[PDB]
Design an enzyme around this catalytic site. Structure first.
Site, short mmCIF file in Angstrom:
data_model
loop_
_atom_site.label_atom_id
_atom_site.label_comp_id
_atom_site.label_asym_id
_atom_site.label_seq_id
_atom_site.Cartn_x
_atom_site.Cartn_y
_atom_site.Cartn_z
N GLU A 77 107.24 -0.88 2.15
CA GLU A 77 105.93 -1.45 2.26
C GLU A 77 105.59 -2.11 3.56
O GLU A 77 104.42 -2.34 3.82
CB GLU A 77 105.73 -2.46 1.17
CG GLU A 77 105.91 -1.78 -0.17
CD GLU A 77 104.69 -1.03 -0.54
OE1 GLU A 77 103.67 -1.08 0.11
OE2 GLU A 77 104.79 -0.51 -1.70
N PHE A 89 106.12 -1.19 -8.77
CA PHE A 89 105.44 -2.01 -7.79
C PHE A 89 104.34 -1.21 -7.11
O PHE A 89 103.25 -1.67 -6.85
CB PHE A 89 106.49 -2.43 -6.75
CG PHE A 89 106.04 -3.40 -5.67
CD1 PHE A 89 106.29 -4.77 -5.77
CD2 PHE A 89 105.45 -2.91 -4.50
CE1 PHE A 89 105.93 -5.67 -4.76
CE2 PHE A 89 105.08 -3.80 -3.48
CZ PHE A 89 105.32 -5.17 -3.61
N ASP A 133 95.43 0.12 2.68
CA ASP A 133 96.60 0.88 2.38
C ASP A 133 96.39 2.37 2.55
O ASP A 133 95.38 2.81 3.11
CB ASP A 133 97.29 0.46 1.08
CG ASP A 133 96.55 0.83 -0.17
OD1 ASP A 133 95.68 1.66 -0.22
OD2 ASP A 133 97.02 0.21 -1.22
#
Ligand code: CL
Ligand code: CL
Length: 162
Positions: free
Chosen positions: A11, A104, A20
């Protein structure tokens, strides 16, 4: 290596709000702020999350703070999920990390829909599952990352991350 490093690798870390790979306002270590297009909404989400007027900027500490909450939330989501729980229970420590990574990234929900892969995973048929995991949007959109996760499931090791 562990879930934190693992995710920290996948990430990255960004102290200013960003977009993102799907184009959502995110910040810190993969902490999604909002799925909406308003940077104000993102700024608001952010302030509310941090408990202060951030002005779209957070310290590393704050970021790490968010991260910890998020990892934790994820674990708990898995543990609370009926399709996920027993899955998680059947796996070894590395592979669990892989599952957490997926959660996640794409939510319990998202993960819960790889039912066929899960099932192969449950049966410990690593090669097969790997193949099946690969047939997904997930893999097609974020291939490098997905290969890492997938290799982890296949191998039961941290090889893809060293
Ligand atoms: Cl939060
Ligand atoms: Cl990727």
């Amino acid at each position: 290596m562990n879930i934190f490093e693992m995710l920290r690798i996948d990430e990255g870390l960004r102290l200013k709000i960003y977009k993102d790979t799907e184009g959502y306002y995110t910040i810190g270590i993969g902490h999604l702020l909002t799925k909406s297009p308003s940077l104000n909404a993102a700024k608001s989400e952010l302030d509310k999350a941090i408990g202060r007027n951030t002005n779209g900027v957070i310290t590393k500490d704050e970021a790490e703070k968010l991260f910890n909450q998020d990892v934790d939330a994820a674990v708990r989501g898995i543990l609370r999920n009926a399709k996920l729980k027993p899955m998680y229970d059947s796996l070894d420590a590395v592979r669990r990390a892989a599952l957490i990574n997926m959660v996640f990234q794409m939510g319990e929900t998202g993960v819960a829909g790889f039912t066929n892969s899960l099932r192969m995973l449950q049966q410990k048929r690593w090669d097969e599952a790997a193949v099946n995991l690969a047939k997904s949007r997930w893999y097609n959109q974020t291939p490098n990352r997905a290969k890492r996760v997938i290799t982890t499931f296949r191998t039961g090791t941290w090889d893809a991350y060293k």
